[PDB]
Design a protein around this ligand. Structure first.
Ligand SMILES: CC(C)([C@H](NC(=O)c1ccc(C#CC#CCCO)cc1)C(=O)NO)S(=O)(=O)CC1COC1
Ligand SMILES: [Mg+2]
Length: 303
Protein backbone atom coordinates (compact mmCIF):
# COMPACT_ATOMS: atom_id res chain seq x y z
CA UNK A 1 0.00 0.00 0.00
CA UNK A 2 0.77 3.73 -0.28
CA UNK A 3 1.15 6.06 2.72
CA UNK A 4 3.43 8.03 5.08
CA UNK A 5 6.58 6.19 6.14
CA UNK A 6 8.55 7.31 9.19
CA UNK A 7 12.28 7.79 8.74
CA UNK A 8 13.63 4.89 10.78
CA UNK A 9 16.76 4.32 12.81
CA UNK A 10 19.47 2.21 11.12
CA UNK A 11 22.05 -0.29 12.30
CA UNK A 12 24.38 -2.72 10.52
CA UNK A 13 22.91 -5.73 8.76
CA UNK A 14 26.08 -7.83 9.22
CA UNK A 15 29.24 -7.60 11.28
CA UNK A 16 32.30 -5.89 9.77
CA UNK A 17 35.90 -6.87 10.59
CA UNK A 18 39.03 -4.90 9.71
CA UNK A 19 42.68 -4.86 10.76
CA UNK A 20 44.82 -1.75 10.65
CA UNK A 21 47.25 0.63 12.36
CA UNK A 22 46.64 3.64 14.57
CA UNK A 23 47.73 6.88 12.91
CA UNK A 24 49.34 8.28 16.07
CA UNK A 25 50.17 5.20 18.15
CA UNK A 26 51.41 3.00 15.33
CA UNK A 27 49.76 0.06 17.06
CA UNK A 28 48.12 -2.83 15.24
CA UNK A 29 44.40 -2.85 15.97
CA UNK A 30 41.51 -5.20 15.20
CA UNK A 31 38.18 -3.50 14.53
CA UNK A 32 34.75 -5.18 14.67
CA UNK A 33 31.57 -3.20 13.91
CA UNK A 34 28.42 -4.87 15.26
CA UNK A 35 24.68 -4.14 15.00
CA UNK A 36 23.09 -2.62 18.08
CA UNK A 37 19.55 -2.10 19.40
CA UNK A 38 17.44 0.99 18.89
CA UNK A 39 18.61 4.12 20.77
CA UNK A 40 22.03 2.62 21.56
CA UNK A 41 23.94 5.21 19.55
CA UNK A 42 27.55 4.52 18.56
CA UNK A 43 29.49 2.89 21.40
CA UNK A 44 33.24 2.13 21.39
CA UNK A 45 34.31 -1.05 23.22
CA UNK A 46 37.92 -1.72 24.28
CA UNK A 47 37.85 -5.52 24.03
CA UNK A 48 41.54 -5.85 24.93
CA UNK A 49 40.65 -4.91 28.52
CA UNK A 50 39.10 -7.17 31.15
CA UNK A 51 36.41 -6.11 31.84
CA UNK A 52 35.62 -4.55 28.48
CA UNK A 53 35.38 -0.77 28.77
CA UNK A 54 32.58 0.81 26.74
CA UNK A 55 32.53 4.51 25.83
CA UNK A 56 29.51 6.07 24.10
CA UNK A 57 30.59 8.34 21.24
CA UNK A 58 29.05 11.46 22.80
CA UNK A 59 30.34 14.99 23.33
CA UNK A 60 30.39 14.58 27.12
CA UNK A 61 33.03 11.82 26.77
CA UNK A 62 35.53 13.78 24.68
CA UNK A 63 38.87 14.01 26.44
CA UNK A 64 41.71 15.73 24.69
CA UNK A 65 41.02 17.21 21.27
CA UNK A 66 44.66 17.83 20.32
CA UNK A 67 45.72 16.05 17.12
CA UNK A 68 42.57 13.90 16.94
CA UNK A 69 39.19 13.46 18.66
CA UNK A 70 39.64 11.18 21.68
CA UNK A 71 37.04 9.56 23.95
CA UNK A 72 37.89 8.99 27.62
CA UNK A 73 36.42 7.08 30.56
CA UNK A 74 38.61 7.04 33.64
CA UNK A 75 42.12 6.15 32.50
CA UNK A 76 40.87 4.42 29.32
CA UNK A 77 40.90 6.24 25.98
CA UNK A 78 39.77 5.59 22.41
CA UNK A 79 41.76 7.74 20.01
CA UNK A 80 41.05 9.15 16.54
CA UNK A 81 37.34 8.38 16.27
CA UNK A 82 36.57 11.18 13.81
CA UNK A 83 37.00 9.40 10.47
CA UNK A 84 34.99 6.32 11.42
CA UNK A 85 32.28 8.50 12.99
CA UNK A 86 32.17 10.53 9.77
CA UNK A 87 31.39 7.31 7.87
CA UNK A 88 28.63 6.41 10.38
CA UNK A 89 27.09 9.86 10.12
CA UNK A 90 27.41 9.99 6.34
CA UNK A 91 25.60 6.66 5.90
CA UNK A 92 22.93 7.40 8.52
CA UNK A 93 23.94 4.71 11.03
CA UNK A 94 22.28 5.40 14.39
CA UNK A 95 23.27 2.36 16.44
CA UNK A 96 26.41 0.22 16.47
CA UNK A 97 29.06 -1.28 18.70
CA UNK A 98 32.64 -0.52 17.63
CA UNK A 99 34.97 -3.11 19.16
CA UNK A 100 38.68 -2.21 19.19
CA UNK A 101 41.62 -4.31 20.39
CA UNK A 102 43.72 -1.20 21.07
CA UNK A 103 43.33 2.43 22.03
CA UNK A 104 43.16 3.93 18.51
CA UNK A 105 40.81 3.36 15.58
CA UNK A 106 42.78 2.11 12.53
CA UNK A 107 43.67 4.83 10.05
CA UNK A 108 43.03 2.68 6.92
CA UNK A 109 43.94 4.89 3.91
CA UNK A 110 43.47 8.18 5.81
CA UNK A 111 39.88 8.76 4.63
CA UNK A 112 36.41 7.37 5.32
CA UNK A 113 36.42 5.45 2.00
CA UNK A 114 37.42 2.03 3.34
CA UNK A 115 34.88 2.32 6.17
CA UNK A 116 32.01 3.22 3.84
CA UNK A 117 32.97 0.36 1.52
CA UNK A 118 33.09 -2.20 4.35
CA UNK A 119 29.80 -0.95 5.83
CA UNK A 120 27.97 -0.78 2.50
CA UNK A 121 29.22 -4.27 1.61
CA UNK A 122 27.76 -5.60 4.85
CA UNK A 123 24.58 -3.57 4.30
CA UNK A 124 22.33 -1.61 6.64
CA UNK A 125 19.23 -2.62 8.56
CA UNK A 126 16.33 -0.28 9.24
CA UNK A 127 14.92 -0.65 12.75
CA UNK A 128 11.41 -0.32 14.20
CA UNK A 129 11.78 3.13 15.75
CA UNK A 130 11.81 6.69 14.46
CA UNK A 131 15.17 8.28 13.72
CA UNK A 132 15.76 11.33 15.92
CA UNK A 133 17.35 14.49 14.51
CA UNK A 134 18.75 17.52 16.31
CA UNK A 135 17.38 20.61 14.56
CA UNK A 136 19.28 23.90 14.87
CA UNK A 137 16.81 26.67 15.62
CA UNK A 138 19.16 29.54 16.57
CA UNK A 139 22.59 30.57 15.40
CA UNK A 140 25.28 29.28 17.79
CA UNK A 141 28.88 30.45 17.42
CA UNK A 142 32.16 29.77 19.21
CA UNK A 143 35.42 31.55 18.45
CA UNK A 144 38.96 31.42 19.81
CA UNK A 145 41.31 33.95 18.30
CA UNK A 146 40.85 33.81 14.53
CA UNK A 147 39.20 30.37 14.51
CA UNK A 148 35.42 30.10 14.26
CA UNK A 149 32.79 27.37 14.21
CA UNK A 150 29.08 28.11 13.85
CA UNK A 151 25.71 26.37 13.61
CA UNK A 152 22.97 28.15 11.65
CA UNK A 153 19.35 27.08 11.07
CA UNK A 154 18.98 25.36 7.71
CA UNK A 155 16.22 23.14 6.35
CA UNK A 156 18.59 20.32 5.43
CA UNK A 157 22.19 19.50 6.26
CA UNK A 158 25.04 21.55 4.85
CA UNK A 159 28.70 21.96 5.86
CA UNK A 160 31.00 24.77 4.74
CA UNK A 161 34.68 25.03 5.60
CA UNK A 162 37.53 27.42 4.89
CA UNK A 163 41.20 26.89 5.74
CA UNK A 164 43.95 29.51 5.54
CA UNK A 165 47.34 27.83 5.11
CA UNK A 166 50.19 29.97 3.79
CA UNK A 167 51.83 27.21 1.79
CA UNK A 168 52.83 26.78 -1.87
CA UNK A 169 50.63 23.70 -2.23
CA UNK A 170 47.54 25.95 -2.01
CA UNK A 171 48.64 28.53 -4.62
CA UNK A 172 43.40 26.82 -4.68
CA UNK A 173 40.46 28.44 -2.87
CA UNK A 174 40.92 26.59 0.46
CA UNK A 175 37.11 26.69 0.69
CA UNK A 176 34.31 24.20 0.05
CA UNK A 177 30.59 23.97 0.73
CA UNK A 178 28.64 20.72 0.54
CA UNK A 179 24.86 20.28 0.83
CA UNK A 180 24.19 16.67 1.87
CA UNK A 181 20.42 16.94 1.71
CA UNK A 182 21.37 17.24 -2.05
CA UNK A 183 24.79 15.71 -2.85
CA UNK A 184 26.20 12.45 -1.48
CA UNK A 185 28.66 12.06 1.37
CA UNK A 186 30.13 8.97 -0.31
CA UNK A 187 30.64 10.92 -3.54
CA UNK A 188 31.70 14.33 -2.28
CA UNK A 189 33.76 13.72 0.81
CA UNK A 190 34.30 10.12 1.94
CA UNK A 191 37.53 9.57 -0.05
CA UNK A 192 39.34 12.71 1.21
CA UNK A 193 42.49 11.62 3.07
CA UNK A 194 44.04 13.23 6.11
CA UNK A 195 47.25 15.19 5.53
CA UNK A 196 50.33 16.45 7.31
CA UNK A 197 53.25 18.74 6.58
CA UNK A 198 56.72 17.23 7.00
CA UNK A 199 57.75 20.04 9.35
CA UNK A 200 54.84 19.21 11.67
CA UNK A 201 55.13 15.44 11.20
CA UNK A 202 58.74 15.66 12.43
CA UNK A 203 57.66 17.54 15.56
CA UNK A 204 54.80 15.08 16.12
CA UNK A 205 57.15 12.09 15.93
CA UNK A 206 59.45 13.72 18.49
CA UNK A 207 56.37 13.74 20.77
CA UNK A 208 55.48 10.08 20.10
CA UNK A 209 52.61 11.04 17.76
CA UNK A 210 51.99 10.28 14.07
CA UNK A 211 53.92 7.02 14.59
CA UNK A 212 51.75 5.14 12.09
CA UNK A 213 51.63 7.86 9.43
CA UNK A 214 53.02 7.33 5.93
CA UNK A 215 52.19 8.02 2.30
CA UNK A 216 50.00 4.89 2.44
CA UNK A 217 47.51 6.54 4.81
CA UNK A 218 48.02 10.30 4.41
CA UNK A 219 48.78 13.12 2.01
CA UNK A 220 52.36 14.05 2.96
CA UNK A 221 53.46 17.59 2.03
CA UNK A 222 57.00 18.93 2.21
CA UNK A 223 57.90 22.60 1.98
CA UNK A 224 56.66 22.81 -1.63
CA UNK A 225 54.66 19.81 -2.87
CA UNK A 226 52.67 16.64 -2.22
CA UNK A 227 55.09 13.74 -1.90
CA UNK A 228 52.59 10.96 -2.67
CA UNK A 229 53.72 9.70 -6.06
CA UNK A 230 50.13 9.19 -7.25
CA UNK A 231 48.92 12.65 -6.25
CA UNK A 232 45.56 13.87 -4.98
CA UNK A 233 42.10 12.33 -5.27
CA UNK A 234 40.43 15.76 -5.44
CA UNK A 235 41.79 19.17 -6.37
CA UNK A 236 40.47 20.44 -3.01
CA UNK A 237 41.21 17.27 -1.02
CA UNK A 238 42.57 19.13 2.02
CA UNK A 239 39.45 21.15 2.71
CA UNK A 240 37.25 18.18 1.80
CA UNK A 241 39.01 16.29 4.57
CA UNK A 242 38.32 19.14 7.01
CA UNK A 243 34.63 18.72 6.15
CA UNK A 244 34.91 14.96 6.71
CA UNK A 245 36.46 15.61 10.16
CA UNK A 246 33.73 18.12 10.96
CA UNK A 247 30.95 15.67 10.05
CA UNK A 248 32.53 13.06 12.31
CA UNK A 249 33.09 15.48 15.20
CA UNK A 250 29.51 16.76 14.89
CA UNK A 251 28.18 13.22 15.18
CA UNK A 252 29.26 13.27 18.85
CA UNK A 253 25.91 15.00 19.28
CA UNK A 254 24.56 11.43 19.01
CA UNK A 255 22.02 12.23 16.27
CA UNK A 256 22.01 13.56 12.74
CA UNK A 257 21.75 17.33 12.35
CA UNK A 258 19.18 19.45 10.57
CA UNK A 259 21.18 22.64 10.14
CA UNK A 260 24.26 24.23 8.63
CA UNK A 261 27.82 24.08 9.97
CA UNK A 262 30.36 26.72 8.96
CA UNK A 263 34.01 26.24 9.92
CA UNK A 264 36.86 28.72 9.60
CA UNK A 265 40.22 27.21 10.60
CA UNK A 266 38.30 25.03 13.06
CA UNK A 267 39.50 21.69 14.35
CA UNK A 268 38.58 18.97 16.79
CA UNK A 269 38.96 21.16 19.86
CA UNK A 270 36.79 24.05 18.64
CA UNK A 271 34.30 21.64 17.07
CA UNK A 272 33.70 20.05 20.45
CA UNK A 273 33.51 23.46 22.13
CA UNK A 274 30.76 24.26 19.62
CA UNK A 275 28.87 21.08 20.51
CA UNK A 276 29.14 21.78 24.23
CA UNK A 277 27.80 25.31 23.82
CA UNK A 278 24.96 24.08 21.62
CA UNK A 279 23.97 21.33 24.05
CA UNK A 280 23.90 23.83 26.91
CA UNK A 281 21.72 26.31 24.97
CA UNK A 282 18.47 24.36 24.86
CA UNK A 283 16.70 27.26 23.17
CA UNK A 284 18.96 26.74 20.14
CA UNK A 285 17.93 23.17 19.24
CA UNK A 286 15.19 20.58 19.53
CA UNK A 287 14.89 16.84 18.81
CA UNK A 288 12.55 16.04 15.90
CA UNK A 289 11.32 12.96 14.04
CA UNK A 290 9.73 12.67 10.59
CA UNK A 291 6.57 10.59 10.22
CA UNK A 292 6.55 11.05 6.42
CA UNK A 293 9.91 10.75 4.67
CA UNK A 294 8.42 12.58 1.69
CA UNK A 295 8.15 15.87 3.60
CA UNK A 296 11.47 15.66 5.47
CA UNK A 297 14.34 18.00 4.53
CA UNK A 298 16.84 15.12 4.40
CA UNK A 299 16.91 11.74 2.65
CA UNK A 300 19.07 8.60 2.75
CA UNK A 301 20.29 5.94 0.32
CA UNK A 302 18.52 2.61 0.19
CA UNK A 303 19.77 0.38 3.04
C1 LIG B 1 44.66 17.07 8.84
C2 LIG B 1 44.54 17.09 10.38
C3 LIG B 1 43.23 17.78 10.75
C4 LIG B 1 44.57 15.66 10.97
N1 LIG B 1 45.78 14.93 10.72
C5 LIG B 1 46.79 14.53 11.66
O1 LIG B 1 46.74 14.75 12.82
C6 LIG B 1 47.95 13.82 11.00
C7 LIG B 1 49.17 13.76 11.62
C8 LIG B 1 50.23 13.12 10.99
C9 LIG B 1 50.05 12.58 9.74
C10 LIG B 1 51.20 11.89 9.05
C11 LIG B 1 52.09 11.37 8.52
C12 LIG B 1 53.32 10.80 7.85
C13 LIG B 1 54.27 10.35 7.33
C14 LIG B 1 55.49 9.76 6.66
C15 LIG B 1 56.52 10.86 6.45
O2 LIG B 1 57.49 10.70 7.45
C16 LIG B 1 48.83 12.66 9.09
C17 LIG B 1 47.79 13.29 9.73
C18 LIG B 1 43.26 14.88 11.03
O3 LIG B 1 42.91 14.41 10.00
N2 LIG B 1 42.45 14.69 12.22
O4 LIG B 1 41.43 14.07 12.09
S1 LIG B 1 45.89 18.19 10.94
O5 LIG B 1 45.69 18.55 12.35
O6 LIG B 1 45.75 19.48 10.28
C19 LIG B 1 47.53 17.50 10.60
C20 LIG B 1 48.60 18.60 10.74
C21 LIG B 1 49.97 18.08 10.73
O7 LIG B 1 50.24 18.80 9.49
C22 LIG B 1 48.87 19.32 9.50
MG1 LIG C 1 40.93 13.92 9.97
Amino acid sequence: HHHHATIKQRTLKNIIRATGVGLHSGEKVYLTLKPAPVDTGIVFCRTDLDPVVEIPARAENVGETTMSTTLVKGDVKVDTVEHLLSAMAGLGIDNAYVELSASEVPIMDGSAGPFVFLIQSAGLQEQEAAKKFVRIKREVSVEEGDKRAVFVPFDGFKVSFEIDFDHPVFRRTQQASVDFSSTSFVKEVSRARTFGFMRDIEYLRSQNLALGGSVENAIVVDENRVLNEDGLRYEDEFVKHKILDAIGDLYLLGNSLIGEFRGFKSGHALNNQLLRTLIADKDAWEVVTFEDARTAPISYMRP
